[PDB]
Design an enzyme around this catalytic site. Structure first.
Site, PDB file in Angstrom:
ATOM      1  N   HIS A   1       1.040  -1.310  -0.365  1.00  0.00           N
ATOM      2  CA  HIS A   1      -0.048  -0.351  -0.389  1.00  0.00           C
ATOM      3  C   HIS A   1       0.700   1.130   0.229  1.00  0.00           C
ATOM      4  O   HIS A   1       0.160   1.861  -0.093  1.00  0.00           O
ATOM      5  CB  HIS A   1      -0.909  -0.286   0.827  1.00  0.00           C
ATOM      6  CG  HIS A   1      -1.931  -0.969   1.263  1.00  0.00           C
ATOM      7  ND1 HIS A   1      -2.648  -0.869   0.851  1.00  0.00           N
ATOM      8  CD2 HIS A   1      -1.773  -2.341   1.918  1.00  0.00           C
ATOM      9  CE1 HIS A   1      -4.094  -1.898   0.712  1.00  0.00           C
ATOM     10  NE2 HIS A   1      -3.338  -3.474   1.537  1.00  0.00           N
TER      11      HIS A   1
ATOM     12  N   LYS B   1      -8.932  13.909   4.031  1.00  0.00           N
ATOM     13  CA  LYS B   1      -8.629  12.638   4.567  1.00  0.00           C
ATOM     14  C   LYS B   1      -7.098  12.312   5.016  1.00  0.00           C
ATOM     15  O   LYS B   1      -6.673  14.004   5.978  1.00  0.00           O
ATOM     16  CB  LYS B   1      -7.604  12.754   2.771  1.00  0.00           C
ATOM     17  CG  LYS B   1      -6.602  14.092   2.884  1.00  0.00           C
ATOM     18  CD  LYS B   1      -6.773  14.679   1.175  1.00  0.00           C
ATOM     19  CE  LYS B   1      -6.152  13.428   0.438  1.00  0.00           C
ATOM     20  NZ  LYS B   1      -7.583  12.733  -0.036  1.00  0.00           N
ATOM     21  N   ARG B   2      -6.823  11.950   5.647  1.00  0.00           N
ATOM     22  CA  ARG B   2      -5.437  11.523   7.154  1.00  0.00           C
ATOM     23  C   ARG B   2      -4.060  13.078   7.268  1.00  0.00           C
ATOM     24  O   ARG B   2      -4.358  13.470   5.660  1.00  0.00           O
ATOM     25  CB  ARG B   2      -4.744  10.525   7.254  1.00  0.00           C
ATOM     26  CG  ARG B   2      -6.073   9.475   8.300  1.00  0.00           C
ATOM     27  CD  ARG B   2      -6.183  10.496   9.334  1.00  0.00           C
ATOM     28  NE  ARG B   2      -4.710   9.742  10.058  1.00  0.00           N
ATOM     29  CZ  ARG B   2      -4.652   9.760  10.967  1.00  0.00           C
ATOM     30  NH1 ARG B   2      -5.959   8.410  11.374  1.00  0.00           N
ATOM     31  NH2 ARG B   2      -3.875   9.333  11.864  1.00  0.00           N
TER      32      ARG B   2
ATOM     33  N   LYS C   1       0.256  14.654   1.754  1.00  0.00           N
ATOM     34  CA  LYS C   1      -0.646  14.653   1.267  1.00  0.00           C
ATOM     35  C   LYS C   1      -0.539  16.235   0.551  1.00  0.00           C
ATOM     36  O   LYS C   1      -1.999  16.590   0.005  1.00  0.00           O
ATOM     37  CB  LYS C   1      -2.049  14.504   1.417  1.00  0.00           C
ATOM     38  CG  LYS C   1      -2.324  13.132   1.676  1.00  0.00           C
ATOM     39  CD  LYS C   1      -3.024  12.361   2.912  1.00  0.00           C
ATOM     40  CE  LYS C   1      -3.141  10.605   2.978  1.00  0.00           C
ATOM     41  NZ  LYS C   1      -3.979   9.963   2.102  1.00  0.00           N
TER      42      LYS C   1
ATOM     43  N   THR D   1      -8.174   6.814  -2.549  1.00  0.00           N
ATOM     44  CA  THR D   1     -10.171   6.238  -2.465  1.00  0.00           C
ATOM     45  C   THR D   1     -10.515   7.215  -1.942  1.00  0.00           C
ATOM     46  O   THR D   1     -12.233   7.789  -2.728  1.00  0.00           O
ATOM     47  CB  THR D   1      -9.985   5.008  -1.773  1.00  0.00           C
ATOM     48  OG1 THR D   1      -9.681   5.043  -0.088  1.00  0.00           O
ATOM     49  CG2 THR D   1      -9.626   4.033  -1.687  1.00  0.00           C
TER      50      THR D   1
ATOM     51  N   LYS E   1     -14.817   8.382  -4.733  1.00  0.00           N
ATOM     52  CA  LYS E   1     -15.649   9.116  -3.905  1.00  0.00           C
ATOM     53  C   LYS E   1     -16.025   9.794  -4.103  1.00  0.00           C
ATOM     54  O   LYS E   1     -17.353   9.985  -4.745  1.00  0.00           O
ATOM     55  CB  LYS E   1     -15.148   8.794  -2.265  1.00  0.00           C
ATOM     56  CG  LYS E   1     -14.889   7.682  -1.925  1.00  0.00           C
ATOM     57  CD  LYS E   1     -14.955   7.852  -0.339  1.00  0.00           C
ATOM     58  CE  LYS E   1     -13.522   6.588   0.546  1.00  0.00           C
ATOM     59  NZ  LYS E   1     -13.524   6.957   1.625  1.00  0.00           N
TER      60      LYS E   1
HETATM   61  O1  KVQ Z   1      -4.983   1.276  -0.655  1.00  0.00           O
HETATM   62  C1  KVQ Z   1      -5.386   1.617   0.595  1.00  0.00           C
HETATM   63  C2  KVQ Z   1      -4.618   2.544   1.038  1.00  0.00           C
HETATM   64  O2  KVQ Z   1      -3.611   2.686   1.930  1.00  0.00           O
HETATM   65  C3  KVQ Z   1      -3.208   3.783   2.256  1.00  0.00           C
HETATM   66  C4  KVQ Z   1      -2.162   3.208   3.522  1.00  0.00           C
HETATM   67  C5  KVQ Z   1      -0.403   2.708   2.970  1.00  0.00           C
HETATM   68  S1  KVQ Z   1       0.358   2.579   4.484  1.00  0.00           S
HETATM   69  C6  KVQ Z   1      -1.088   2.685   5.139  1.00  0.00           C
HETATM   70  C7  KVQ Z   1      -1.427   2.339   6.566  1.00  0.00           C
HETATM   71  C8  KVQ Z   1      -2.277   2.498   7.731  1.00  0.00           C
HETATM   72  C9  KVQ Z   1      -2.215   2.533   8.704  1.00  0.00           C
HETATM   73  C10 KVQ Z   1      -1.353   1.932   9.542  1.00  0.00           C
HETATM   74  C11 KVQ Z   1      -0.110   1.829   8.695  1.00  0.00           C
HETATM   75  C12 KVQ Z   1      -0.241   2.167   7.308  1.00  0.00           C
HETATM   76  N1  KVQ Z   1      -1.970   2.803   4.598  1.00  0.00           N
HETATM   77  C13 KVQ Z   1      -2.627   4.763   1.019  1.00  0.00           C
HETATM   78  O3  KVQ Z   1      -1.534   5.433   2.242  1.00  0.00           O
HETATM   79  C14 KVQ Z   1      -3.307   4.968   0.184  1.00  0.00           C
HETATM   80  O4  KVQ Z   1      -2.510   5.560  -1.023  1.00  0.00           O
HETATM   81  C15 KVQ Z   1      -3.897   4.006  -0.297  1.00  0.00           C
HETATM   82  O5  KVQ Z   1      -5.097   4.224  -1.127  1.00  0.00           O
HETATM   83  C1  PLP Z   2     -11.696   7.158   1.678  1.00  0.00           C
HETATM   84  C2  PLP Z   2     -11.740   7.595   2.942  1.00  0.00           C
HETATM   85  C3  PLP Z   2     -10.550   7.852   3.687  1.00  0.00           C
HETATM   86  C4  PLP Z   2      -9.162   8.086   2.713  1.00  0.00           C
HETATM   87  O1  PLP Z   2      -9.096   8.766   1.743  1.00  0.00           O
HETATM   88  P1  PLP Z   2      -7.524   9.286   0.557  1.00  0.00           P
HETATM   89  O2  PLP Z   2      -8.251  10.728   0.668  1.00  0.00           O
HETATM   90  O3  PLP Z   2      -7.861   7.607  -0.197  1.00  0.00           O
HETATM   91  O4  PLP Z   2      -6.404   9.759   1.868  1.00  0.00           O
HETATM   92  C5  PLP Z   2      -9.986   8.533   5.008  1.00  0.00           C
HETATM   93  N1  PLP Z   2     -11.189   8.529   5.656  1.00  0.00           N
HETATM   94  C6  PLP Z   2     -12.478   8.246   5.478  1.00  0.00           C
HETATM   95  C7  PLP Z   2     -13.467   8.437   6.646  1.00  0.00           C
HETATM   96  C8  PLP Z   2     -13.196   7.765   4.338  1.00  0.00           C
HETATM   97  O5  PLP Z   2     -13.992   7.430   4.257  1.00  0.00           O
END
Ligand code: KVQ
Ligand code: PLP
Ligand code: KVQ
Ligand code: PLP
Lengths: 810, 810
Positions: free
Chosen positions: A351, A542-543, A548, A650, A654
């Site tokens: 990922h 997003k986080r 980002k 993702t 959406k």
């Molecule tokens: O495939 C689902 C999503 O995975 C995200 C990701 C990569 S690593 C990661 C992670 C999440 C929680 C604890 C440790 C690592 N999340 C990654 O940052 C996104 O680009 C991706 O859409």
């Molecule tokens: C879909 C979703 C994400 C992932 O969003 P990204 O823009 O791809 O980081 C994170 N948090 C929530 C609550 C979501 O529904």
């Protein structure tokens, strides 16, 4: 009311009312005179759960008879959100329950709002696991989600004086009506101890036992009467644990801590023992269950014909040595046979490429906690490096690079290396990400075993992410092209023959305007805030991460503000700029960015010259249920990660599905979104992967951009001098310092092209008809981004099973 | 099958079967092909709970309309045992459920055995609280049991190599179907902080908040359709608690420890902070609830007309200063008015005179944890000692003795003193105990306020302790005199006209023999042990204590053994001697006594000369559900505490009711049992209170008895020399040493008269007809020992409410 919510039959509605009153009385022990909205939510929850139960029992029964190949999705995270509306949608009960609740004088929507999110995830990865379970059930796969029932999910975010405060997500306070405890299938998990070597092979002894107790949650498919299972493990102390007396009982909490709290890091690795305990706990309990179910069908040659195990990143990588340990030490298979079985059973989804996110566990931790697993890992490494040496004789450098064991101050296991070695398939999560894996961090593994590397571009479930959150858009689509698209999203292409239809253009804009009115009012009620709903809704949710580039967004917002102050009496397309997300609690820079966002808002929202032309809103506690509200209300989706950092995303999908145009970099699934819609229907700007690499070779000098772009220098001088923090002039020196000297994500390099591209968004927004026509071209090409396509690809190209849309009998 | 178990109507049985299958499917999500006996127990539990729910709702409703005076029974312990059979008995569902389960091919008795005891108590005191709740519901009193929902009740006792091992009582592992969580009535409880004095009086600030979450359990009355409430509080951390992040969430367990574990001391005080936290927690949350309910009827003059609070020993003594604190600091009443309200609301039951059992809390603990309560306690002490000084001018000694504050190395609060000062009634729990209170430890308080001191002799509920555990005896009684006796136990006197009836004498002996066969078989199954069921069943079951003199029993058993070895070929009435009970885990001497009991058994049960003439059995894990089995099987009840130590006892009454003759001292309720049956129908032996006092004045010299009684010297030489511990000759030196030099309970002083009285028991056992006639005279006079008599006395003479046997409508 609306067609895609199903029938409200006279019998159905009468029966839902009888059972709602039965649960209020017998289940909740309330009469109607003392019941609160929360009692009414519970009575309804119990009433809809009753419709799941027959289907769940018959589905699990059917899998016992037919004995199909079983899929096991191992994730530390399932970001489920709320269950009630999702259950109603998938059982076609939504109108019947609306009607039944209306006749009892209740508003179903008000009761829906009382459900706690099951927030057992951080963001993209946890939510992908939830979208996947929905798609696996909709495609009639015999699939099981396995994870941890954390007592506390992702923290609740409060803003105090513009700063993030964390509060414990006590999501189980009022009970979870969706889960069924199965204490009778409690399994032992072992920790610590030591290895004894005998005549009869190796033996793991003097271990501490933790019990894993499973909770089963139903996962209904879309109107196919399939209900799959999400099994989550809870940690329980054995009754002889520590057994002066009082302290021994209180010390039970040491063992139960394993499943107490989700680690709140997104795309970051924290090497803490409690995290490794969580990783083993879910793997150890899950593999015993998998093997128990397999043996109720001696001969492990057939194991990979009956079992697929998908690893959601490296978090459950210990599944590989654990499966070897069980097969070699307990079932007495020889090494080579056990390894063949392991490789053909396991598959690994990567990922991220961010170095700080890759799991590299210190050897001293694995040595103490899982001594036998470390022995099996060294043995895997030896036999793996012997194959590398034979294929690349004399390339000692390759051997150092591909080793599962990293040398250094502290020795580490590279868990990603373990996953590639022990898996028959390794996939990235978008085409550009899967290409980057083959050209960079896994180049060596790709040259040894090219056949293992696949792409499976991510998706989102159109059930939650269209039908459930955006019923008005679902309906006007269903008016034109029918309902079939909800389980076959490629049918949305039929909407291209309506881009010149005036009624359809009017209906798309009306749904968007209704969503915006509804969301503006939600802001007023819950957070006493006043936004213009005729403004462009510019949304980045997003986080909070440096990669980002919320900061790039901040720079645009201050640019817009400085342009208004310089020429106050000139027309600008009005915007509500909304930024929301959680920062990991120990991520200092992410916490500073939240503070800067609110500090910009404090200046911009109170400037009388600005008026209702520019608002900056921090959306507090961004979570799945806030996403269902704000995504449908959005005009512009901000997908502005530095090229090569966002593996997929993702969120992007959406918003494409829900009638927002995308401003984004050629990163992650953005690239394939643009390919599906046409580059001309997408606001693409900034460096490609190739351009970032060119900058890296010559050196990123931020000074150069500050020296050449007067608009950018103004912003930096404002940040530095306390324009945005009057009582603390140096509040943001860390942010300025990082942007000028240590910006890994090259915020300034994309600034000029971002601002120019944002002017093109404004220009198109002035022309409603051509904005809405471009929106239609986006919705119409969003089919590829259904998790149904993703899972069908996992099923055919990794798991070796055929999806099915055939209904089980009711 | 039997009449007192109620009707199995065709409609009732059909309906119980439908609902049992509904719960198995919808509630447990099991089909009949995978259900275990435990799923069948749960489906039945849920089915009987459904019959409680209407009655519970209508009862709580009725108390809101009629607004009667409310009784609040505050106890740290409710020893409830199992709920299922009790619910069926009291709702008249027992035969209907037997029939309904039989027709589904299940044995109800087998499913009953799967229920965990709610073991939230140590013994007599906790079980009195449970018998009381049953009697309060049967007498239609608007009564509430308030306590703590401990996660872990009294420990499970294992014997390893004759030694007690403790295991955690994980009684909630599988869920509790009887309780209803009420998270919506969660209340804050405060700890630590400091007192600020303002203009507007005193203010408790900077406190730590723990939340108290209530769980409601229904308490059905006997066929009167009354269902009262037992509310138990669970400790919960607030969501901002400690709020690096991970540790703050894990540290929530510090606050939740308050309700984690029952302290396992019987008739002993441990001055630990966690124990004081439990005592405040139940008092603080309960008084807020009491006051909330009162205000939904400003004017606190009426508080004691609407509220009675009963303190079960001093464990909830803080109710007195807490009520003052709320009335003075929060409601702004003046001191004197608040105190008048407090005294007229509170009443105190004393349960012991043993010095080591009286709660004396160090001032430094109260100072840190409850600073405001300590201020209110000093103020109570000052105004109380001013009344003593005025009534007894110049008696400075009285002032030191009656002080709530004890002087010494550490200052202590005497909680008993606080209770007498702050209560309008103080009662002991048997006539001799209430007399000892007036002549000894509370003499001074009695001379100041003679009007406060009452007796309320303890009782047991004839529902659990006859109908439920001994249906065969209930039935042969009902055959002769009808069913009315079950709620009016004085009607058992009518049995005196049947002491010369041959059929009745035959039926009483047949029930006893059936109970003994049933219990002998229970021993074989669950604990692979072989007892002669034609033997006299000599049973001592109670907590293991020096004062209860299990050791005196041990001396008799070794005497019997030595008499058999000396004259092997002479007839002795065969006996199974069964001793059972738990020792407090830190009570070294109690743990040694268990070990000696098993060591006697290891020698006696394996001697071929002895044969089946003498068996010694330690009954493992003595608890409420083992009491329901062994009490009905007993011939001889051992009630052999040193005169003046057992305040009442309640075991004694259970066995009187169930057809056992009593060997006992003139201690506790034994005195009133003998008075009711006639001294000639009782095996009374040993020192009276008067004789123990005479011995204390001259000095207890154990040597004297060892020198004069050759049979006793033989036993001591056997204990000392390792006759009973061959591989550890000195194992029991602590026991010999204590009996010879530091015996507070004068075991040797009662030895001669005990052995002679035990010969009279054997003599009568040879004559079955005259044994059974004496048994009838005991059963026939056991009416006084019903908790219905006890509660009617509390109600008329303390609470100021009239009991009622009138049914609520169904
Ligand atoms: O495939 C689902 C999503 O995975 C995200 C990701 C990569 S690593 C990661 C992670 C999440 C929680 C604890 C440790 C690592 N999340 C990654 O940052 C996104 O680009 C991706 O859409
Ligand atoms: C879909 C979703 C994400 C992932 O969003 P990204 O823009 O791809 O980081 C994170 N948090 C929530 C609550 C979501 O529904
Ligand atoms: O009245 C009920 C019973 O109370 C017993 C008792 C006295 S003190 C006590 C206690 C119990 C638990 C923790 C602390 C003290 N139990 C007491 O020992 C018995 O005689 C009596 O029958
Ligand atoms: C009744 C009872 C007691 C009290 O017995 P005593 O002989 O009065 O000490 C203790 N434990 C249990 C389980 C009981 O049922």
């Amino acid at each position: 009311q609306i067609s895609v919510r199903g029938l409200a039959g006279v019998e159905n509605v009468t029966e839902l009312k009888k059972n709602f009153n039965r649960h209020l009385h017998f289940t909740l022990v309330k009469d109607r005179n003392v019941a609160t909205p929360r009692d009414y939510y519970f009575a309804l929850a119990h009433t809809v759960r009753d419709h799941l139960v027959g289907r769940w029992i018959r589905t699990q029964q059917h899998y016992y008879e037919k004995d199909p190949k079983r899929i096991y999705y191992l994730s530390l995270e399932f970001y489920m959100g709320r269950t009630l509306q999702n259950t109603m949608v998938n059982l076609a009960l939504e109108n019947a329950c609306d009607e039944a609740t209306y006749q009892l004088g209740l508003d179903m929507e008000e009761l829906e709002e009382i459900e706690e999110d099951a927030g057992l995830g951080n963001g993209g990865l946890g939510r992908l696991a939830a979208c996947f379970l929905d798609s696996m059930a909709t495609l009639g796969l015999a699939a099981y989600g396995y994870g941890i029932r954390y007592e506390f999910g992702i923290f609740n975010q409060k803003i105090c004086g513009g700063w993030q405060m964390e509060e414990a997500d006590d999501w189980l306070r009022y009970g979870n009506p969706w889960e069924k405890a199965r204490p009778e299938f409690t399994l032992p998990v072992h920790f610590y101890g030591r290895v004894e070597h005998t005549s009869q092979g190796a033996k793991w002894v003097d271990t501490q036992v933790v019990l894993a107790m499973p909770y089963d949650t139903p996962v209904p498919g879309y109107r196919n009467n399939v209900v799959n299972t999400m099994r989550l493990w809870s940690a329980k102390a054995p009754n002889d644990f520590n057994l002066g007396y009082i302290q021994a009982v209180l010390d039970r909490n040491l063992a139960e801590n394993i499943s107490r709290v989700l680690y709140p890091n997104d795309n970051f690795f924290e090497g803490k023992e409690l995290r490794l305990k969580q990783e083993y706990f879910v793997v150890a309990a899950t593999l015993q269950d998998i093997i128990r179910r397999f043996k109720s069908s001696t001969n492990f040659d057939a194991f990979p014909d009956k079992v697929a195990i998908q690893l959601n990143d490296t978090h459950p990588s210990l599944a590989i040595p654990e499966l070897m340990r069980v097969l070699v030490d307990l079932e007495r298979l020889d090494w080579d046979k056990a390894w063949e079985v392991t490789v053909k059973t396991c598959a690994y989804t990567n990922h991220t490429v961010l170095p700080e996110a890759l799991e590299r566990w210190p050897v001293h931790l694995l040595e103490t906690l899982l001594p036998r697993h470390l022995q099996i890992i060294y043995e895997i490494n030896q036999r793996f490096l012997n194959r590398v040496a034979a294929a690349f004789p004399g390339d000692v450098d390759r051997l150092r690079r591909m080793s599962l064991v990293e040398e250094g101050a502290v020795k580490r296991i590279n868990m990603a290396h373990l996953c590639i070695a022990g898996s028959h398939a390794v996939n990235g999560v978008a085409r550009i990400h899967s290409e980057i894996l083959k050209k960079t961090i896994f180049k060596d593994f790709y040259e040894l075993e090219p056949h293992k590397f696949q792409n499976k571009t991510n998706g989102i479930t159109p059930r939650r992410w269209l039908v459930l959150c955006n019923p008005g858009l679902a309906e006007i689509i269903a008016e034109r092209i029918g309902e079939e698209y909800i389980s076959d999203l490629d049918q949305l292409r039929k909407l291209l023959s309506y881009v010149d239809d005036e009624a359809f253009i009017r209906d798309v804009a009306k749904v968007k305007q209704e969503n915006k009115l509804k969301f503006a009012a939600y802001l007023e009620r819950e957070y006493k805030v006043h936004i213009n709903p005729n403004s462009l809704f510019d949304v980045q949710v997003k986080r909070i991460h440096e990669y980002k580039r919320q900061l790039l967004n901040c720079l645009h917002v201050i640019t817009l503000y400085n342009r208004i102050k310089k020429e106050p009496n000139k027309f600008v397309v009005p915007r509500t700029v909304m930024i929301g997300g959680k920062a990991a609690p120990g991520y200092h820079m992410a916490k500073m960015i939240i503070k800067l966002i609110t500090a910009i808002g404090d200046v911009v929202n109170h400037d009388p010259v600005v008026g209702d032309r520019l608002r900056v809103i921090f959306l507090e506690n961004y979570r799945v249920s806030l996403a269902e509200k704000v995504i449908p209300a959005a005009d512009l989706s901000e997908q502005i990660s530095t090229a090569g950092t966002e593996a997929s995303g993702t969120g992007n999908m959406k918003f494409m599905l829900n009638g927002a145009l995308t401003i984004g970099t050629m990163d992650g699934a953005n690239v394939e979104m643009a390919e599906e819609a046409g580059e001309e229907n997408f606001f693409i700007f900034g460096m490609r992967v190739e351009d970032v690499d060119r900058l890296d070779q010559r050196g990123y000098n931020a000074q150069e951009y500050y020296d050449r772009i007067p608009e950018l220098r103004q912003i930096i001088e404002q940040l530095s001098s306390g324009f945005f923090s009057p009582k603390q002039p140096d509040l943001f020196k860390d942010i300025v310092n990082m942007l000028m000297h240590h910006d890994r994500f090259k915020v300034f390099a994309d600034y000029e092209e971002y601002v120019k591209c944002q002017e093109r968004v404004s220009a198109l927004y002035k022309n409603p008809r051509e904005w809405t026509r471009m929106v239609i071209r986006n919705i119409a090409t969003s089919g590829k981004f259904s998790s149904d396509r993703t899972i069908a690809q996992y099923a055919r190209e990794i798991w070796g099973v055929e999806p099915s849309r055939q209904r089980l009998p009711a």
